Amino acid sequence: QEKLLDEAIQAVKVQSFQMKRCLDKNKLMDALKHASNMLGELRTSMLSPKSYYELYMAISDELHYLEVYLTDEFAKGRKVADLYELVQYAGNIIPRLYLLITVGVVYVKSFPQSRKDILKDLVEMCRGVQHPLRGLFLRNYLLQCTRNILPDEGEPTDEETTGDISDSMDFVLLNFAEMNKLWVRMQHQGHSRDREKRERERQELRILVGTNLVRLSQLEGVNVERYKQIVLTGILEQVVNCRDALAQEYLMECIIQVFPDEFHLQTLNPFLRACAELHQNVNVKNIIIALIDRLALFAHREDGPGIPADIKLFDIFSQQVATVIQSRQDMPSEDVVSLQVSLINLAMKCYPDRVDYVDKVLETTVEIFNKLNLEHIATSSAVSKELTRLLKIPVDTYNNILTVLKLKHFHPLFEYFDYESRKSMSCYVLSNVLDYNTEIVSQDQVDSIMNLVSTLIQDQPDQPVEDPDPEDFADEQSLVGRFIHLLRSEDPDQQYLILNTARKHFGAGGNQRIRFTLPPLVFAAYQLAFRYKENSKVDDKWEKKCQKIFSFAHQTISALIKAELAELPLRLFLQGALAAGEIGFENHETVAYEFMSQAFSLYEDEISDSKAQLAAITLIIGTFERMKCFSEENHEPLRTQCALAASKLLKKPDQGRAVSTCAHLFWSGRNTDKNGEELHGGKRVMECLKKALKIANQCMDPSLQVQLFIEILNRYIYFYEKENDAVTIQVLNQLIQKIREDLPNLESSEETEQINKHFHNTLEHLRLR
Amino acid sequence: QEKLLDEAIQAVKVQSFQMKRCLDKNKLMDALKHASNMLGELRTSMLSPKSYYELYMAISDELHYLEVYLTDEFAKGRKVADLYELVQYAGNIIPRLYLLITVGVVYVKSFPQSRKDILKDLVEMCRGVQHPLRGLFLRNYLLQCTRNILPDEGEPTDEETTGDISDSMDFVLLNFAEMNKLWVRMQHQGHSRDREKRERERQELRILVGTNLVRLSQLEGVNVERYKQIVLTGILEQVVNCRDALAQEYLMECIIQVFPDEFHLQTLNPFLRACAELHQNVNVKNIIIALIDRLALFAHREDGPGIPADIKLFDIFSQQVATVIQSRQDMPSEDVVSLQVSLINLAMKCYPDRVDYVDKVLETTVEIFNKLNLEHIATSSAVSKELTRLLKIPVDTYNNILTVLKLKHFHPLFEYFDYESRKSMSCYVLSNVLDYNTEIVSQDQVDSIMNLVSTLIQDQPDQPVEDPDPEDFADEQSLVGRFIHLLRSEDPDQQYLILNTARKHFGAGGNQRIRFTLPPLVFAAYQLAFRYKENSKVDDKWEKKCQKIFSFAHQTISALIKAELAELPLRLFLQGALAAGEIGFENHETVAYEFMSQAFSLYEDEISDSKAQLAAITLIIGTFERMKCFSEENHEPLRTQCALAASKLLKKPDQGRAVSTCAHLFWSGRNTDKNGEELHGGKRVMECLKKALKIANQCMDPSLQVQLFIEILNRYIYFYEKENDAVTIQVLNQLIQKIREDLPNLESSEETEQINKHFHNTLEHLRLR
Amino acid sequence: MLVLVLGDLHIPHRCNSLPAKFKKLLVPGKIQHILCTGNLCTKESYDYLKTLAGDVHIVRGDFDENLNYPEQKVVTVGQFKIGLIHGHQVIPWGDMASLALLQRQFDVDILISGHTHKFEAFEHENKFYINPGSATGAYNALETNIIPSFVLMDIQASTVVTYVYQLIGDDVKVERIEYKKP
């Protein structure tokens, strides 16, 4: 409708205008008659809660001009006695009580001696109140009137003036209990179908109720002991006695927010035991979270003593929240976890130091999850969402992942999760383990981490299943790379053991995996092999350590070999050979010779492509050429075996290149006979170039024939200028002649020109032609 | 109506009854009164010419019975004079004159002295008649009466009989002029709206006209000399002067049919000048063809003088026809060519000797086509049809095709063919040039052939050629077959050149064509290589010839390689390798090595299919082994490279079979060290079988595992009995047993039984059973 | 029944057709069976074959275009079980011992194969071996002198008479050979 309101405010402004008119003209009772008829305007009630409220606030503001008028009058001494009796002539209860409050506060100001008596009267006679709307607005007027003048402790105490802080406290608690009664009574008045309207209106009025607590809080007298003994005992008596939920919850959060934590800390177990008896339909969770948030901002609030050690917050709150959960019957487990998250945050921020607390947290979370007969929680469940948000907090907050390995009870948490979520989180954690460089680990914790890796590399949707996905796969390697790196920073004796557990682990890796994982391990072996020789003084079994580790490498390599691979094992034998060569230990030649024959075997057996041949032989020659530990009895077999194998190849072009490459084998070929230098028998070098020449004379391809002569010519120059006396200048002349008598017979091509440039540069450099 | 007709035929039958009644009772004049009554029936105008014809034939055939009746009475001596006046008593002119003719011939028989006079009388007395139909029917009665009594060569020269051949000629020339006058007047009589009725009617009476010439032809007295001077000269003046087309054409056809070639050869050209002035609207082609047909049956007519050489008939008719065509206004070109076709057939069959004539004709046809600036001939156009039919006479007739190739203009006429028609006609012609097998061809004629192919296969297609079926998809086989055929007949070094030109020629043929064309050329190369060996006694530079021919083949093949095919070239390489091997020239070994390595290259690069894998490698192995000129130093490497290539395949079954097949390679090999004797490398053969065995033991697939064991077993027996000591009988026992201790561990199959039979037969074949 | 055995025609790779005289001897009606070893190569040659008779059997040769032919096939003709294979799969190419080894596996009384282009008709350990040769005398690198030929056998019952048709000179010489199950 909304008209009632404007018409009413019109009539109100009329009567309060004629009211203030009579009050300036100083004929009081006529003003009080207009004021009375005006408050008669409040006898309509159909107004909206908001509308009625505005009319109320309007009339209160006009009454303020009256209150200051009276206050002045009494301060001027012009006081008429017995005002309550004369005013009780007003036939209705409403004028009487508006008059009583108004004159009461004036007398209290003017007669502080009368304060106790007037308050005790007003508090006792308000028990008459039974109607919700007018009673509410009256007791609000009471609350605003009582804003400041109530007894207090730092107040002048005239033994005529009676009333103390205890009296003020009793005053407000009593008026509160009566108003809250009417307000809850508001739940059931009217028809049961206005319940949402009713609850909306009450929600609107909740601030009216909380204003009592605001009033209680400005009371200077509120010491911790009064808070302990009086305030909470009264409030908890009504709360436990009211067994409602909407009001209790609102009022209790307002308390939480309002009072200082100093008072709360002295009154926690009473307040939390009270919290535990509350109604089941209550979202206690949001309350508790608000509480946790307030004590968290209280923990890291500095400019304070910190947490007194006698105050074992965690044990207290833990046991009471626990009691609250027992008191709760239908808790969503997700809600339990949302609280567990805040329980983490608290333990984390107040005591990073004390891990046993965190473990007690993990044990209670675990016990919760076990009593829950839950399967590995899929992506859809909010429960997994929460468990994720919970667990990442230790994961995110504990910068050092080594510290996690001090928590044995963490690993049990992996169990409850889905494989997909385990995979996501395991990626998240290990990524954190690399981002936060957390380094070389204790063996047992190395074990448990390796157990975690074994779960990553061995499990699939939530069991090992191959449902193939075209997607990346190489996210798992770099991680292991890092692991392996930090692993090597132990002392010598630890590595063999760590190496063995790493070995078994990768043995359990698979077949689709190990090709990329083991190479780093190979380099590990090498560096430690280097460590043993560089430390050949304080160790006497270092040569033995080298032998065992090289045997270890051989098996590991053979492991890679069974996967039916070629390239990698070939290279791993080369690197191992080189290492043993540099170490030069006892039996080192024999070991190297063994490692070599494995390499040769791989070469023959695992020989595939022309390109692959050239690459394999180039690697064999480069490794072979600097190897110098073998004496002629050992150097010579391999030497001839290599010469023949090489001379067997596929393609004549490549054939000529290889045969020419072999020269170096006859020149760099240095064995332990005359103590590492080559005997320098020009003759075998000559025969080598001879076969190369023969192959040239057979190629019969202009373009390639010429190109090959220019290379072999340059090669000749290298050895002539390398003082191979056998290289006569006469041979070079006869051949250059042949090359001259052939060079013209060419078409135009991109190469022939470059071959000319090469040749011209070559003749221009040397000057000895 | 047809009724008019029926009433007439009834009254006729009535009246012919009255004839026979009077003929019985000898009342001639009473029969003739009724004869007059029949002819009154002829006064009708409603009947059709055919209807009149039927009624006439009825009255004529019955009147002959009267005529013979009268003739008999007169033959009986009862001769009555004064007949001329009495027959004039008939009121109708027709009975009078019919009586005059009937009795006249009677006087001629009874009074031969009067024959001349009576005939001249009757021919002159015909001036009475002027109506076309009845006059015609009269003159028919005349023609049958005079059919036999006219003078001729086979008449008795009785000094009473009168009248000569000259009288007969004057008689018929006159009857001709008279009948054509009446007949032509029939053209313009009646309304012009009966043009189709008149011309149909004319067609009907046309036989009446031709019977006169038939009568002239039975005349023995029609000799060649009267025909030459007088008869044909007379006939041609009336004929040419009638300046009509329908009559001229009919009479001329009758001419063609009627006169002998005896008359025609002495009178063609007078007659042909007459032919040249004739009326424009006539079809002359049909005239000329009829003439051509008769002179054609004279050309191939045996037991006759043929054509005297002095009278060059073809040149005469050619020149006259040319003049006639000049005389023609716009005569369709297709018709000129239909005439050209008969001029071809004729010159070929009547003057086979003079091809040069046919060339003068083809050249003159060319000037005609040049003069006619016409666009290409549409597929519908009859002109192309005829030009095709024209060209085939040389094609079908002349078995000798060089002379066609000597026709320079034979190709330029092709211009007028449209592209679709160029394709269709060129295909048909070249196909005909092929269906006769063609022998050796000179370089120049290979050229003209290559020009024919280049026009047949491919210029740029007229439109971007859209092909449901691009050809008869491969219809060009015979073409290459023949090429190849004639090539082996020319002497050798020229052939190589021709082959090179053949290469460039087809290289320019197209894109998807040459794939089928060059292999045969490859086969050519081989055979020429064979010719070179057959010339190995007088020649030493044969090896140089060989070097060039194999080098030519190498490029050509590499060209095919670019065309991106693998398998086929592989076999072509095989054959080339074999060829060089058999030739055994210097550098032959090198040649064999390139063919092998390029083939291997193709194997590696172009490898896609397992089946293709097995087939290519089995063929490679099967092909090499006969390669036996190689030095052991060279033979041995290559073998191993092949063995290795084999050992790198994917699938285990095939791998085992192949590895076992390779054994022969290690034994059947022969070194050039043993002067042709086999290297006998049993040891390595054994090792081959060893590795094979190990691979066998891994089959673990029962049916094939065992069957494969059986082959390896056969291999052992083969070598054991082949004096290969390493093959112990103990191994064979161990293996037969192992197969025995395993054959049961098998479910029975169609195979397992055969495996027992095989094993028993195998042991029995040792003569040890 | 009488069967026709030919192959290695190699049309149009090396030959364009069967010799003139041979064409005059192979006419429809007479033949009830045809076993073709060789690579006739072109489907054009398969149709001609389909002319002489209706029941034609062909095995894939090392140069046939159509890959749809059998590597080898076993066809029963009355009392006789006959095997068919081109020959290039038999190593060494025309080796009797290798052919024989093949006979066991097939379990046939008679074994037809070609590839060598040399006519062969002989008996070995109670089994019969036939090689028609090349009906067109098709070229073959291993033998510089090839002789056109085909072979039709006549089976009465557990008795075969194979007629070998060679083209020596102009005239067509012939030879008779009889074999009867063991």
Next chain:
Amino acid sequence: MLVLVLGDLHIPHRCNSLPAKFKKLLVPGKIQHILCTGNLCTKESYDYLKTLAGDVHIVRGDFDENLNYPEQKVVTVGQFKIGLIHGHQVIPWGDMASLALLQRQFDVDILISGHTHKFEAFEHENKFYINPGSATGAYNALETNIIPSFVLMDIQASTVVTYVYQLIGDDVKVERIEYKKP
């Protein structure tokens, strides 16, 4: 223009990334060219490179996973013709005479190669040779003491100034070397 030259990172075979300080010196915008010798191994390292600049050139090293890289490549940078190769193809491995022999064939004014993991910048017969070393100080059996490093050259015109970046101790020492076409 200035170009960046590095290689032999060997990630993740022997190293996990470039030294901390070096990463702080290589930032986008500055580099217009990148010539990479070594085997960075993982495509992960190719992307990082693709960050510093857009025109990146890489040659295949003896341990790179992707076989799609060039064994050697010649790239022109202004007035300079520069060759690129990893080095393992040069025998003996770091031999000047062998590198030189290679320079002729390529016909380049400057030749970049690695494989030895030892920084080298020198002139020989009017040509320039550069070896960045290992940007990650990657392990190498032949030299027990490897020093991280890269090298960026600045070309104005027919004049180059190559800055060698070594990681000795903590600080990053530097050295300047100039070369100008003959």
